[PDB]
Amino acid sequence: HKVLLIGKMYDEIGEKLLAEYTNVEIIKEPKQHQIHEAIQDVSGVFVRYPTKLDAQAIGLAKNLKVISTSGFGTDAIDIAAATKRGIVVVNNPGLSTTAVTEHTLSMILALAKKLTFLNQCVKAGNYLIRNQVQPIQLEGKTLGIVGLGMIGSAVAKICSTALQMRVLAYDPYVPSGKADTVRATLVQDLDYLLTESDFVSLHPELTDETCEMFDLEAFKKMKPSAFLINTSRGKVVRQPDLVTAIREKLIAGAAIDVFEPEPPAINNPLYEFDNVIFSPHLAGVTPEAGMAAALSAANQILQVLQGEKPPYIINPKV
Amino acid sequence: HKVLLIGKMYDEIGEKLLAEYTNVEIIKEPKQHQIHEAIQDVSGVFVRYPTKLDAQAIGLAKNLKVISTSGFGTDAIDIAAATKRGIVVVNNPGLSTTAVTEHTLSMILALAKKLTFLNQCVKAGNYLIRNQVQPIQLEGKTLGIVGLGMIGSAVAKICSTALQMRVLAYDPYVPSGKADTVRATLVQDLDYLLTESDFVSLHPELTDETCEMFDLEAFKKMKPSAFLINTSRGKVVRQPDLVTAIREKLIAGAAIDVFEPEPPAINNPLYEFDNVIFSPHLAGVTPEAGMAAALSAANQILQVLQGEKPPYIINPKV
Ligand SMILES: NC(=O)c1ccc[n+]([C@@H]2O[C@H](COP(=O)([O-])OP(=O)(O)OC[C@H]3O[C@@H](n4cnc5c(N)ncnc54)[C@H](O)[C@@H]3O)[C@@H](O)[C@H]2O)c1
Ligand SMILES: NC(=O)c1ccc[n+]([C@@H]2O[C@H](COP(=O)([O-])OP(=O)(O)OC[C@H]3O[C@@H](n4cnc5c(N)ncnc54)[C@H](O)[C@@H]3O)[C@@H](O)[C@H]2O)c1
């Protein structure tokens, strides 16, 4: 039994847990030829987001029986080619709730306190910028949350109680008591959340309903002084509409951690604007969260290699 | 009765409150000659931090009876020259507690989530930096707070309960129950706080005891992975020792909002380091906080012009 690690895990504990039971090779940022040679006899595959497992590589893997992503996203795996051969594709979701909550708070406060802008002014000797701009006090301001899931609830709870913000939440599949629990108000009309909020943070599941649900019409309804925070999925925002919204000052700025596509091109049009700050899809990649997903990825590989049904099968039809 | 506004107030409501009762002139970023001409017959003076009121300008003001700073700092007023002439110098402290608390949280999270560093990597097309660095999960980490005053307590309360951090506090003039109230542990040995903390935030009163109390010896005791946050006063940190500490990687980085001296020179040696982020003394200058200090400054000017003792006299001997 051999296992191939396409990319390091977010923590080396999952790799030692696999080395104790199988023969493991690790390849960091490989070319396609390195994948083709190292996957022939391999029995389990781990894929580090967002590198891609294609139908050719899956076709060359003769003994392959289980594939594990590093986290929730499977948009880089050819699941169809893997189902045809009956290969188990496994996920690792929901191990980074606390990491993304902290990251959303960091970016909300960064936009409000004008962190990156004020930093360059002082480094460039423009201390006198404190006569033209001012930071935003969060207390009393309205935070609008799309998606009152695990992460959206946690962000709502902190901003309402610790930051004394007014929290509105939009989620068609949630009882209003869930909003009441975290001291938020559930709002059905998304226009109301858009027109009321000084800060809009996205935490919904990526579905056909939420795919590109934040487009130019939504940005137009938002306050020109409002900010957008996106730590969910890149496909929730129609990227060109976010460019127009920023360029035409339809919103005051944004902070995004997820992209479409991933990885983003080096010439992304959003990089130009200073009121838009980025992080390379790391809101859920803290050491504590990376250690959980790495262990979870190691278990599910071993469980399939031993004929046990792992908890997060993407294609249960095999 | 005329009043001179050396610099705009942090909000124009205090200026209208003075315009209703006196003749007001406002000068923005003046030369010394503009001050000399506009202060001769003036009866009240407002000074916007950190511009300086010198003994010459005070000497030329014949009808001057009250001086008000914009906030707490009076290190830019020649209080001695004003006391000689019996002029009331007035302060405006403690109106920005919530503003600085939010600002400290923003900077703590910014250092932990590596905000500014990860932002330039993505803008420079280095999305793959997520393979070399990782953000820090605050949960379980130790926050060390120097000065359990109004702001230090508020920061401690949020980081302990909302962020699930371990909070240690150093303050010789505070009962341990005050730390227990905000779910922190009061620590007498400052070495213990230095050696234990992953994040050190400064909120003490600037005294002879706290003047330059954070020097090279203190940085050496700190963890090389720890971060420094300074929203108190610039004189609490011995600036050259912070340069050596950063350059020699004695600490992982810093986030400072206050300087010594203020304003800082355009060629400050700290501007060079990327793990050091700045804001131009704005932690207490939110609109809500700026509106309070502006009203407070307007009242104390009018109260002296009407023979009423204002609450924040710097030189009560007049
Ligand atoms: N940036 C990262 O590294 C990272 C890490 C983990 C998760 N995420 C993403 O964060 C997002 C939120 O995470 P989660 O664990 O809390 O998801 P979740 O499953 O706990 O809940 C998401 C919520 O979305 C809601 N929702 C569904 N459709 C909606 C719609 N049309 N409008 C409004 N709300 C809708 C659902 O009711 C659900 O409550 C997910 O998209 C997840 O992929 C990102
Ligand atoms: N950046 C800004 O714009 C801004 C705005 C307001 C206040 N501040 C500064 O923030 C700092 C804290 O504000 P505050 O209102 O909470 O002050 P505070 O008066 O409420 O309390 C400060 C604490 O310092 C403690 N202290 C005194 N000596 C100490 C020592 N040797 N060691 C440890 N602790 C000691 C005191 O016991 C007191 O509890 C002050 O220096 C203030 O000037 C900055």
CATH classification of the domain holding A101: 3.40.50.720
**What's the Cα-to-Cα distance from A53 to each of A3, A68, A74, A76, B315, rounded to whole Å?**
15, 11, 10, 6, 74
Interface membership of A261 toward B (CB under 8 Å): no
Pairing of strands B23-27, B2-6: parallel
Q: Do A280 and B116 touch (CB under 8 A)?
A: no
Q: Please check whether residue B315 lies inside any domain of the structure.
A: no
DSSP at A22: S
Q: Are residues B102 and B91 in the same domain?
A: no
Q: Using a CB-CB distance cutoff of 8 angstroms, which residues of chain A are in contact with residue B279?
A: 113-115, 118-119, 122, 135
User: Chains A and B: how many Cβ contacts under 8 Å?
Assistant: 183
Q: From the CA of B50, how many Å to the nearest CA of chain A?
A: 10
A87 shares its domain with A153: no
Minimal CA separation from A85 to chain B, in Å = 31
The verdict on A170 and A300 lying in the same domain is no
- With respect to residue B293, please indicate whether it lies within any of the assigned structural domains: yes
Residue corresponding to tokens 């702001």: B151
A14 CB less than 6 Å from ligand 1? no
Q: What's B313's DSSP letter?
A: B
Question: d(Cα A124, Cα A136) in Å, to the nearest integer?
Answer: 22
Surface-to-core class of residue A287, CB atoms within 10 Å of its CB (0-12 exposed, 13-18 middle, 19+ buried): middle
- Chain B nearest CA to A280, separation (Å): 5
Across A190-311, where does the E strand assignment appear? Answer: 199-202, 227-230, 253-256, 276-278
Q: Do A318 and A309 contact (CB within 8 A), yes or no?
A: no
Could you tell me if residue B147 is left (phi over 0), alpha (psi between -120 and 50 degrees) or otherwise beta?
left
User: Would the CA dihedral through A281, B224, B210, B192 be positive or negative?
Assistant: positive
Return phi, psi of residue A284, to 5°.
-105, 10
CB atoms within 10 A of CB B33: 8
**Does the CA dihedral B271-B276-B278-B283 come out positive or negative?**
negative
Residue where the block lists tokens 């460039």: A124
Place of tokens 């979870």: A296
Are B157 and B244 members of one domain?
A: yes
Q: Hey, is the C-beta of B146 within 8 angstroms of any chain A C-beta?
A: no
List A117's β-bridge partners, or say none.
Answer: none
Asked if the structure places residue A315 within a domain, the reply is no
CB count, 10 Å around CB of A137? 23
Contact B283, B103 (CB under 8 A): yes
Note whether A271 contacts B8, CB cutoff 8 Å. no
Total domains present in chain B: 2
Shortest-distance ligand to the CA of residue B174: 2
Is B110's CB within 8 Å of A106's CB?
yes
Q: Cβ separation of B119 and A288 shorter than 8 Å?
A: no
Phi, psi torsion values for B195, nearest 5 degrees: -75, -20
B151 CA to centre of ligand 2 in angstroms: 7
Angstrom distance (rounded) from CA A95 to CA A108: 22
CB B236 within 8 A of CB B230: yes
Same domain? For B225 and B298 the reply is no
d(CA A245, CA A60): 46
How far apart are the C-alpha atoms of A97 and A102, rounded to whole Å?
A: 9
**From ligand 2's centre to the CA of B87, what distance in Å?**
27
User: Crossing angle for the helix pair A150-161 and A97-112, nearest 10 degrees?
Assistant: 50
Nearest CA to A135 among A162, A117, A155, A121?
A117
**CA separation, residue B114 to residues A133, A318, B20, B135, B136 (Å):** 24, 42, 49, 6, 8
Tokens (6 digits) for B86: 């019996």
Task: Find which of A26, A130, A262 to mutate to test the B interface (most B CBs within 10 Å of its CB).
Answer: A130
Burial category of B317 from C-beta neighbours within 10 Å (exposed 0-12, middle 13-18, buried 19 and up): exposed
Q: Is A262 a catalytic residue?
A: yes
Same domain as B71, residue B211:
no
CB A199 within 8 Å of CB A229: yes
* Interatomic CA distance for residues A209 and A206, integer angstroms: 8
Cβ atoms of B61 and B44 within 8 Å: the answer is no
Of the residues A28, A29, A101, A115, the best mutation for testing chain B's interface (the one with the most B CB atoms within 10 Å of its CB) is A115
Burial (Cβ within 10 Å: 0-12, 13-18, ≥19) of residue A19: middle
Token code pair at residue A82 = 């893997």
On whether residue B172 sits in a domain, the answer given is yes
CA–CA min distance B15, chain A (Å): 16
Kindly state whether residues A136 and A274 are assigned to the same domain.
yes
Per DSSP, which regions of A16-107 are E strands? 23-27, 44-47, 66-69, 88-90
Interval between CA A12 and ligand 1 midpoint (Å): 27
In angstroms, the CA B40 to CA B46 distance is 14
Instruction: Give the whole-angstrom CA distance, residue A123 versus residue A316.
Output: 55
Whether B70 and B213 map to the same domain: the answer is no
Round to whole Å and give the CA distance between A272 and A278: 11
Report yes or no: A17 and A44 within 8 Å, Cβ to Cβ.
no
Q: Are A150 and A97 in contact (CB under 8 A)?
A: yes
- Dist CA A45 CA A15 (whole Å): 12
Stated resolution in angstroms: 2.6
Distance between alpha carbon B189 and the CA centroid of its chain, in Å? 25
Do the Cβ atoms of A29 and B131 come closer than 8 Å?
A: yes
A121 and A244 together in one domain: yes
- Contact criterion met (CB < 8 Å) for B277 and A115: yes
Consecutive H or E run containing B99? helix B97-112
Residue B188: closest CA among B209, B170, B174, B203: B170
Inter-residue contact B240 to B274 (CB < 8 Å) = no
Experimental technique, in short, is X-ray
Report the pocket of ligand 2 as residue ranges, CB < 6 Å.
Answer: B 72, 94, 96, 100, 146-152, 170-174, 203-207, 209-210, 231-233, 257-258, 281, 283-284
Phi, psi values for residue A41, rounded to 5°: -95, 0
B261 and chain A: CB distance < 8 Å anywhere?
A: no
Chain B residues with CB under 8 Å of A234 CB are none
Are B61 and B202 within one domain?
no
Note whether A29 contacts B131, CB cutoff 8 Å: yes
**B174-182: long-range pairs with CB below 8 Å, 24+:** B174/B148, B178/B148, B178/B153, B179/B148, B181/B153, B182/B148, B182/B153, B182/B156, B182/B157
- From edge to edge, which strands make up the β-sheet containing B23-27? B23-27, B2-6, B44-47, B66-69, B88-90
* Interchain pair A113, B287: CB under 8 A: no
In a mutational test of the B interface, the residue from A8, A122, A160 whose CB has the highest number of chain B CBs within 10 Å is A122
Residue A79 and residue A26: Cα distance in Å, rounded? 22
* Cβ–Cβ gap A264/B158 under 8 Å: no
Residue A121 maps to a domain: yes
A137/B99 CB distance under 8 A? yes
Query: What three-state secondary structure class fits B162?
Result: coil
Angle of CA points A94, A95, A98, to nearest 5°: 100
Nearest to A123 among B115, B130, B271 (CB): B271
- Which ligand does the CA of B98 lie closest to? 2
Q: Is B274 part of any domain? A: yes
Q: Are B84 and B109 contained in the same domain?
A: no
Task: State whether B133 and B161 are in the same domain.
Answer: yes
Q: Which structural domain range is residue A108 located in? A: 97-278
- The answer for A 232-251 residues in CB contact with B (under 8 A) is none
Question: How close does chain A come to B309, measured CA to CA in Å?
Answer: 31
Measure the CA–CA gap between B72 and B312, rounded to whole angstroms. 10
B317 lies in a domain? no
Axis crossing angle, helix B97-112 with helix B150-161, rounded to the nearest 10: 50
B residues 48-77 closer than 8 Å to A (CB): none
CA of B205 to the centre of ligand 2 (A): 4
3-class secondary structure, B296: helix
Give Cβ neighbours of residue B184 (< 8 Å, ≥ 6 apart).
B145, B148, B156, B160, B167, B168, B169
Contacting A residues, span 28-47, partner chain B, CB-CB under 8 Å: 28-29
Is A310 part of any domain? no
Round to whole Å and give the CA distance between B21 and A316: 78
Helices A97-112 & B115-123 angle (0-180, nearest 10): 80
| Chain A: residue whose CA lies nearest to B136 | A286
Indicate which residues of B carry an active-site annotation: 233, 262, 281
